[PDB]
């Protein structure tokens, strides 16, 4: 019996994965497809959805002459209709495209990448992690007016003259720049193939030929064919405007654009937190067949389309509260575009509550291709702001159409109620293909910050900031935490690039001085080149200050943790407290105190900087800083160095009172004479740079070395210590150091180590106690080790701690060795009197500035992503004329 | 309990009908297309999917200099390619379309709109039939260089140049001729808008936007302007020639060409009973992406573009036999296609037997956004003809690829074994998107005639007459049935119609003197006018012979059945069998049995004659011709007509021997006056026409009147009859009439009756005992009533009889009365001694040649489609230079 059990158990598994299988599969059919961002350039300065609702909601006509730029035949009949302010500009060299090229490539080719790039921004994508994916690509494109023919064109563009003006590129050259894998096709159906494109998206997604989908149209009207054309046989207005439905309608006006719709199925962009500006719910294309004649409307055609769209979507005609109709103010088409929307949204209706109809060829004239894409925004915007705009120039309800079903002459509202909202688009082709699509709304959701941003250029770089201003300006609604965030998280890193670091008022000014090239204080600034071999070093004298991460211990999780974790260590060797010690700001004198704590700040310095995704290739210590990189490195357990640190500190108290040490800024040479004139009194400690070394030894032979020098121009500091190590006043304790520091247990390490000790990069299961007696002991050689990993092919050198002391030598130390102007840098962590995570962020922000790879997500917690600004496109005129 | 026991009972059946349900939702959106039909337009003079074979097969290569003809600017280096024959000769007429409106159109639109309408002639549709209904239009274009601009296009053809050059317009104007109402669109891919556009029409008829639906592409260079492109950048062979995968290989060939499927699903072309060529299993597109340049194309994604097509397709790399390789003779694109399907397909072999790969471009050049559907045809026909074509030029095997796949080099052989074969074919476009489609053998499928035919012009019709003898003299194994079947029920009837009868050899000589503008026995040959009207036509003596139907007894069940029920009829009134009587071929010398049989002959030819669709919607009798003409108007019942001419005859033997008729070549009023010297003794019984007569009266009398008029060279026609009716000896015959004509009961008739005793048209009712004296007494006036029926509109006389008696007569009245040359055909049913159901079909084919519609199917019982020749365009060239 009981296995006649589990037999139904796993017989109603098969039939319960089957069920829902079946439901997904018909789900996945017929499911919604979410526009998930859009970008648009229309007559009317207009290169925004937000602009775009400006002009319509206002009430804007675009309608005028056509610019002289073009290289247009003159005409006594002045060109009226709806041109594009800059339809020859582009920013050719953000897309990898020569001059040459550029110049030979229509209009419409371009404006599409911007408009692409634009659009996944504002989706929420760094474009260029899209590169390799399946997006797909589907534009409508009526017309190519643009170049001279092959056969009479300058002979610097005949390579690219084809393909630079060929249907299919404008689909394929978006493919190929974004480097999408999807597949790519230019649809031609005349006015509707902005729909029609769309609907071949949203069918693609729903089969699951791709993930995303980039669904536009454009037209530019390079050439005035066009207009030489419909002049010919009747159709344009007089007036140059388009009246859809009034008294007044003479004909249409012509006019140019171009519009893209990232879509994404509904459940997936749920699932990945994209905002769903809206949704599209069903579509439909057909043709009017057998109409009068190819050019002429047929009513019985729009009909069926408006119902397989409603069938598509699953909505009823009386739920549509709004159509954008195709209204492009002709004598034939305007009745019978009404009568179709009549007798099919209408015959659903009361008087008491009518289907409502507008036009934005009113506003922008007949944009073509792009008409339709022009459609959807206006529904979709519409949707997102509760409003439907006014449909200029309506003179009285033309008389030609027998009037449920009313069109909006003064703005009327559209509030969010009970049911959701939709909207119908419908546009017909001239050549007789129909399309009509339906728009719902979008269903329901739900200390200082360093703020990253880079251009491809310098300038590219400051627009950026000033634009990220105005818009936190305009918007204070929104966090500074999701901005940041999202700017770290969801756009692309280029090559100049700025790091604005504080709160939200620090933020703004920052970004405001970057904006005019002036620098604010916690600002990092460079250009990035690609780094390959972080080298940590690791000082030693020099980089303590008495506040010390007083602030950062505070401030930061990832550090006090680390710290936490050395106090527990130097329990035993030691009898203070590190943290009241650091906590407290207390005084930094003794040796046995000062030793071991820059050695916790300087590993828990190195946590942090590894929490941010920036780990060690390699790492050099000097003197006491030995310990520390040994740590990091991985040779050293912490116990082992912690008690290291102490052991050696406790032990160096022995030669207190008797010599002191001076940094002097000459070289080896230059002070292995003057040093030897003392026999064995002085000895050089290190040498950190060319022109830098340590001299130690006993004071009064000391001090008329210092003397003498401050005497003919020398850099001679006094270091604030009462010892000289790396001298022979250490043989005294060299019982004492072999005695109580052997039990300690190297390892060879994960990480390269550039002993200074030695001399070379070592194995460091070398580092037994012989060793550490010998990094007392012996002279540094940090200039040595610099070098190696100069040649050794390190870029990136990390200065772990409290205060730069290294940095400077460093440098001096790659002139001499690197190809000059050839690419490494060095960057320190914190400085005097600036620990706190703020400096923190300002250290990594130069690391990142110059091209270090860092994981800011650490310094934004939870935040989810939020919509910026779009990149600013340095752009250049390229026209080709006829 | 059993509790479990009954619940694996119900869920096994739940799991059972869930996986039908999913099954068959799974299987309706991934099934098999079926290709339905396919015509093509290519270099080498091809024009058919036969011929392109035969060009194919035979190892053609057609690469040859461009033509004179196409205005183009001579040049040094000659252009070599793939060029079309005759690219600018359209019949422009058979669409509609003005010559000035042709001028201006695109060739690309031209081309498609003829094949088009080949294509589904061969998918055995008459396009007519399919205008309404959802055929969708898919098309691949790349470019369109036909005009001038608007800007210098002649002012004659300047409202045309937009339209006749829109891409848009390639998809649509097919479906505004065809009255297609299906989504229609062009398609923009490059080289591979061919594949895409098929693999986009796969998807619209598997979501069911339509039914059926045209896939293809074309490509025809108006210009030279790729020639001057390409002359740039490398990459043109300079032989003309692709060499795919030889060392030979300089670059590819520029050509043109135009291909397209009538596609349809699987499971509906089954259902419909229809030619299955070939199957379309599965798809897909994509894009190269990120590759090393535009043009540049990139094996990663050919092999994911194929293994993307395979799952769909449902097929494993290893169950396809044969590629049809790009192939283009690219020395960088040739490799890595190679390459790519080493690693797809030929990864799943074992060497012993490899993947073969060939391409057409080879034979006919690259054929740009035709290629790929040139590429399918390849295939589907290869798969029919078991073979596999030789590719031409290969020297060697490319020392630059890397060689389980191997190209085919000499003509393998490809036999329909235990597996179905299939192919991929592949074909890559230049800006990068990239598609694959694959392809399976077509599933297992299992007396004279009347031959009709017609053409818009006369020309059309006799070259169709050409086509049709040819096909038929060589495929013996179409069936002459079937093939008159076809041409009656799949075939548009235009305006000139030949209709041809025979046995085979005999419709073969018939057949071919319509082509040569000759005659021969059952040959009708016709214009066609729109006749509203049939007037059925009933004459009286004259019109019998002895056999009589005895041939048309045995062949026609109609007519047979119809003797049968007057038999059962006349019966009572009369002591013979009408069979016996027919069938025998037995005398009918005397009035009682003549006159019973005539109107039985008659009265079932009507009923054949509506048998084929032709109803009287007027009738009218001559003397006893009344009887049969009131039944048929449904006047009298068979029984009532029946008594009234057997009693009618029966008493008309009591003048046996007292007079006689003959029918006289001259007018009422040369008659009167000629005859009024025998005051009475002779009458004008019947005027038939304005010069012909019948005078009935005393033998004698009558005899003088013939002797006078065969003196004089009249013509002077003895009635081989005892009596003189329709003259004073027939008082002595009204009282036995009125007595034994009563109980005869006439109503009112669904048909209009013409009454030639009256003078007028009639209520049917009035035909009492005193109105059927009256019929006997007195003067017929046929004349008065054909020229009320002229008079009244009618155009389509049909002389219901066995053998044409009156037909002469009408002709010469309707000269007089209707405007001499408007219309009028006049037509009889069989002739003496050419009884038999042939000769019958004869009479409709005089009929039908002249626009009374005729339906034809009873002719053919049990009658199967049959593939045909398609119609021959009658062609002009029409070239806009530059
Ligand atoms: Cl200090």
Same mark, same amino acid.
């Given at each position: 019996?009981?296995?006649?059990?589990?037999?139904?158990?796993?017989?109603?598994?098969?039939?319960?994965?089957?069920?829902?299988? $079946?439901?997904?599969?018909?789900?996945?059919?017929?499911?919604?497809?979410?526009?998930? #961002?859009?970008?648009?350039?229309?007559?009317?300065?207009?290169?925004?959805?937000?602009?775009?609702?400006?002009?319509?909601?206002?009430?804007?006509?675009?309608?005028?002459?056509?610019?002289?730029?073009?290289?247009?035949?003159?005409?006594?009949?002045?060109?009226?209709?709806?041109? $594009?302010?800059?339809?020859?500009?582009?920013?050719?060299?953000?897309? #990898?495209?020569?001059?040459?090229?550029?110049?030979?490539?229509?209009?419409?080719?371009?404006?599409?990448?911007?408009?692409?790039?634009?659009?996944?921004?504002?989706?929420?994508?760094?474009?260029?992690?899209?590169?390799?994916?399946?997006?797909?690509?589907?534009?409508?494109?009526?017309?190519?007016?643009?170049?001279?023919?092959?056969?009479?064109?300058?002979?610097?563009?005949?390579?690219?003259?084809?393909?630079?003006?060929? *249907?299919?590129?404008?689909?394929?050259?978006?493919?190929?720049?974004?480097?999408?894998?999807?597949?790519?096709?230019?649809?031609?159906?005349?006015?509707?193939?902005?729909?029609?494109?769309?609907?071949?998206?949203?069918?693609?997604?729903?089969?699951?030929?791709?993930?995303?989908? $980039?669904?536009?149209?454009?037209?530019?009207?390079?050439?005035?064919?066009?207009?030489?054309?419909?002049?010919?046989?009747?159709?344009?207005?007089?007036?140059?405007?388009?009246?859809?439905?009034?008294?007044?309608?003479?004909?249409?006006?012509?006019?140019?654009?171009?519009?893209?719709?990232?879509?994404?199925?509904?459940?997936?962009?749920?699932?990945?937190?994209?905002?769903? $500006?809206?949704?599209?719910?069903?579509?439909?294309?057909?043709?009017?067949?057998?109409?009068?004649?190819?050019?002429?409307?047929?009513?019985?055609?729009?009909?069926?389309?408006?119902?397989?769209?409603?069938?598509?979507?699953?909505?009823?005609?009386?739920?549509?509260?709004? %159509?954008?109709?195709?209204?492009?103010?002709?004598?034939?088409?305007?009745?019978?575009?009404?009568?179709?929307?009549?007798?099919?949204?209408?015959?659903?209706?009361?008087?008491?509550?009518?289907?409502?109809?507008?036009?934005?060829?009113?506003?922008?004239?007949?944009?073509?291709?792009?008409?339709?894409?022009?459609?959807?925004?206006?529904?979709?915007? !519409?949707?997102?702001?509760?409003?439907?705009?006014?449909?200029?120039?309506?003179?009285?309800?033309?008389?030609?159409?027998?009037?449920?079903?009313?069109?909006?002459?003064?703005?009327?509202?559209?509030?969010?109620?009970?049911?959701?909202?939709?909207?119908?688009?419908?546009?017909?082709?001239?050549?007789?293909?129909?399309?009509?699509?339906?728009?719902?709304?979008?269903?329901?959701?739900?200390?200082?910050?360093?703020? &990253?941003?880079?251009?491809?250029?310098?300038?590219?770089?400051?627009?950026?900031? #000033?634009?990220?201003?105005?818009?936190?300006?305009?918007?204070?609604?929104?966090?500074?935490?999701?901005?940041?965030?999202?700017?770290?998280?969801?756009?692309?890193?280029?090559?100049?690039?700025?790091?604005?670091?504080?709160?939200?008022?620090? !933020?703004?000014?920052?970004?405001?001085?970057?904006?005019?090239?002036?620098?604010?204080?916690?600002?990092?600034?460079?250009?990035?080149?690609?780094?390959?071999?972080?080298?940590?070093?690791?000082?030693?004298?020099?980089?303590?200050?008495?506040?010390?991460?007083?602030?950062?211990?505070?401030?930061?999780?990832?550090?006090?943790? *680390?710290?936490?974790?050395?106090?527990?260590?130097?329990?035993?060797?030691?009898?203070?407290?590190?943290?009241?010690?650091? *906590? #407290?700001?207390?005084?930094?004198?003794?040796?046995? &105190?000062?030793?071991?704590?820059?050695?916790?700040?300087?590993?828990?310095?190195?946590?942090?900087?590894?929490?941010?995704?920036?780990?060690?290739?390699?790492?050099?210590?000097? *003197?006491?800083?030995?310990?520390?990189?040994?740590?990091?490195?991985?040779?050293?357990?912490?116990?082992?160095?912690?008690?290291?640190?102490?052991?050696?500190?406790?032990?160096?108290?022995?030669?207190?009172?008797?010599?002191?040490?001076?940094?002097?800024?000459?070289?080896?040479?230059?002070?292995?004479?003057?040093?030897?004139?003392?026999?064995?009194?002085?000895?050089?400690?290190?040498?950190?740079?060319?022109?830098?070394? %340590?001299?130690?030894?006993?004071?009064?032979?000391?001090?008329?070395?210092?003397?003498?020098?401050?005497?003919?121009?020398?850099?001679?500091?006094?270091?604030?210590?009462?010892?000289?190590?790396?001298?022979?006043? %250490?043989?005294?304790?060299?019982?004492?150091?072999?005695?109580?520091?052997?039990?300690?247990?190297?390892?060879? !390490?994960? %990480?390269?180590?550039?002993?200074?000790?030695?001399?070379?990069?070592?194995?460091?299961?070398?580092?037994?106690?012989?060793?550490?007696?010998?990094?007392?002991?012996?002279?540094?050689?940090?200039?040595?080790?610099?070098?190696?990993?100069?040649?050794?092919?390190?870029?990136?050198?990390?200065?772990?701690?409290?205060?730069?002391?290294?940095?400077?030598?460093?440098?001096?130390?790659?002139?001499?060795?690197?190809?000059?102007?050839?690419?490494?840098?060095?960057?320190?962590?914190?400085?005097?009197?600036?620990?706190?995570?703020?400096?923190?962020?300002?250290?990594?922000?130069?690391?990142?500035?110059?091209?270090?790879?860092?994981?800011?997500?650490?310094?934004?917690?939870?935040?989810?992503?939020?919509?910026?600004?779009?990149?600013?496109?340095?752009?250049?005129?390229?026209?080709?004329?006829?």
């Amino acid at each position: 019996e009981e296995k006649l059990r589990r037999y139904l158990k796993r017989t109603v598994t098969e039939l319960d994965s089957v069920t829902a299988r $079946l439901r997904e599969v018909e789900h996945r059919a017929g499911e919604p497809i979410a526009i998930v #961002g859009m970008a648009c350039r229309f007559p009317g300065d207009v290169d925004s959805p937000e602009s775009f609702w400006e002009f319509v909601s206002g009430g804007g006509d675009a309608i005028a002459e056509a610019p002289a730029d073009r290289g247009w035949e003159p005409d006594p009949d002045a060109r009226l209709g709806g041109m $594009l302010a800059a339809a020859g500009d582009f920013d050719a060299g953000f897309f #990898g495209i020569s001059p040459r090229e550029a110049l030979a490539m229509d209009p419409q080719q371009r404006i599409m990448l911007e408009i692409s790039w634009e659009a996944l921004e504002r989706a929420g994508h760094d474009p260029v992690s899209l590169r390799g994916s399946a997006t797909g690509v589907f534009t409508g494109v009526g017309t190519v007016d643009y170049g001279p023919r092959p056969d009479e064109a300058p002979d610097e563009v005949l390579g690219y003259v084809g393909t630079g003006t060929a *249907s299919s590129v404008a689909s394929g050259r978006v493919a190929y720049c974004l480097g999408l894998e999807g597949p790519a096709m230019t649809v031609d159906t005349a006015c509707s193939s902005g729909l029609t494109a769309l609907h071949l998206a949203m069918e693609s997604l729903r089969r699951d030929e791709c993930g995303l989908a $980039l669904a536009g149209g454009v037209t530019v009207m390079s050439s005035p064919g066009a207009f030489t054309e419909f002049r010919s046989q009747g159709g344009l207005a007089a007036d140059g405007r388009c009246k859809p439905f009034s008294k007044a309608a003479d004909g249409f006006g012509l006019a140019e654009g171009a519009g893209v719709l990232v879509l994404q199925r509904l459940s997936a962009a749920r699932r990945e937190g994209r905002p769903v $500006l809206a949704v599209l719910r069903g579509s439909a294309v057909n043709q009017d067949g057998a109409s009068n004649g190819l050019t002429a409307p047929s009513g019985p055609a729009q009909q069926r389309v408006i119902r397989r769209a409603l069938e598509n979507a699953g909505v009823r005609a009386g739920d549509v509260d709004y %159509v954008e109709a195709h209204g492009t103010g002709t004598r034939l088409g305007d009745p019978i575009e009404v009568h179709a929307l009549l007798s099919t949204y209408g015959a659903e209706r009361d008087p008491d509550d009518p289907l409502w109809i507008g036009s934005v060829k009113s506003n922008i004239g007949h944009t073509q291709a792009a008409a339709g894409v022009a459609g959807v925004m206006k529904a979709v915007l !519409a949707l997102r702001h509760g409003e439907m705009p006014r449909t200029l120039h309506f003179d009285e309800p033309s008389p030609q159409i027998e009037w449920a079903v009313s069109v909006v002459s003064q703005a009327r509202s559209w509030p969010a109620g009970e049911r959701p909202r939709r909207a119908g688009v419908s546009s017909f082709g001239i050549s007789g293909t129909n399309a009509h699509v339906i728009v719902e709304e979008a269903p329901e959701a739900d200390g200082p910050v360093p703020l &990253v941003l880079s251009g491809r250029d310098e300038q590219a770089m400051r627009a950026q900031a #000033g634009r990220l201003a105005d818009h936190l300006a305009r918007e204070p609604r929104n966090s500074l935490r999701d901005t940041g965030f999202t700017l770290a998280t969801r756009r692309s890193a280029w090559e100049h690039r700025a790091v604005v670091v504080g709160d939200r008022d620090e !933020a703004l000014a920052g970004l405001r001085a970057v904006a005019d090239g002036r620098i604010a204080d916690r600002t990092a600034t460079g250009q990035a080149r690609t780094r390959r071999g972080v080298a940590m070093v690791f000082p030693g004298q020099g980089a303590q200050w008495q506040g010390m991460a007083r602030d950062l211990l505070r401030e930061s999780q990832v550090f006090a943790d *680390s710290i936490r974790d050395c106090e527990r260590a130097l329990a035993p060797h030691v009898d203070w407290s590190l943290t009241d010690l650091l *906590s #407290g700001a207390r005084p930094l004198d003794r040796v046995d &105190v000062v030793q071991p704590a820059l050695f916790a700040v300087m590993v828990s310095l190195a946590a942090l900087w590894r929490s941010h995704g920036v780990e060690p290739a390699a790492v050099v210590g000097h *003197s006491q800083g030995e310990i520390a990189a040994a740590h990091v490195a991985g040779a050293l357990t912490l116990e082992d160095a912690a008690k290291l640190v102490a052991v050696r500190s406790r032990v160096l108290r022995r030669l207190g009172g008797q010599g002191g040490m001076a940094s002097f800024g000459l070289g080896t040479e230059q002070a292995a004479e003057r040093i030897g004139r003392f026999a064995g009194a002085l000895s050089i400690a290190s040498v950190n740079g060319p022109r830098s070394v %340590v001299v130690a030894g006993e004071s009064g032979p000391l001090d008329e070395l210092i003397a003498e020098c401050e005497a003919e121009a020398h850099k001679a500091r006094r270091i604030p210590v009462d010892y000289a190590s790396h001298s022979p006043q %250490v043989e005294s304790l060299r019982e004492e150091l072999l005695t109580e520091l052997a039990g300690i247990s190297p390892v060879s !390490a994960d %990480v390269a180590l550039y002993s200074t000790t030695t001399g070379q990069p070592i194995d460091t299961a070398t580092m037994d106690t012989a060793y550490w007696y010998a990094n007392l002991r012996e002279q540094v050689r940090f200039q040595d080790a610099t070098r190696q990993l100069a040649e050794a092919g390190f870029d990136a050198f990390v200065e772990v701690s409290p205060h730069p002391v290294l940095t400077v030598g460093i440098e001096a130390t790659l002139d001499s060795a690197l190809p000059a102007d050839a690419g490494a840098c060095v960057v320190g962590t914190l400085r005097r009197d600036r620990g706190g995570l703020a400096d923190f962020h300002t250290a990594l922000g130069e690391a990142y500035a110059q091209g270090v790879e860092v994981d800011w997500s650490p310094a934004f917690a939870d935040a989810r992503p939020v919509e910026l600004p779009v990149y600013p496109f340095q752009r250049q005129r390229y026209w080709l004329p006829i």
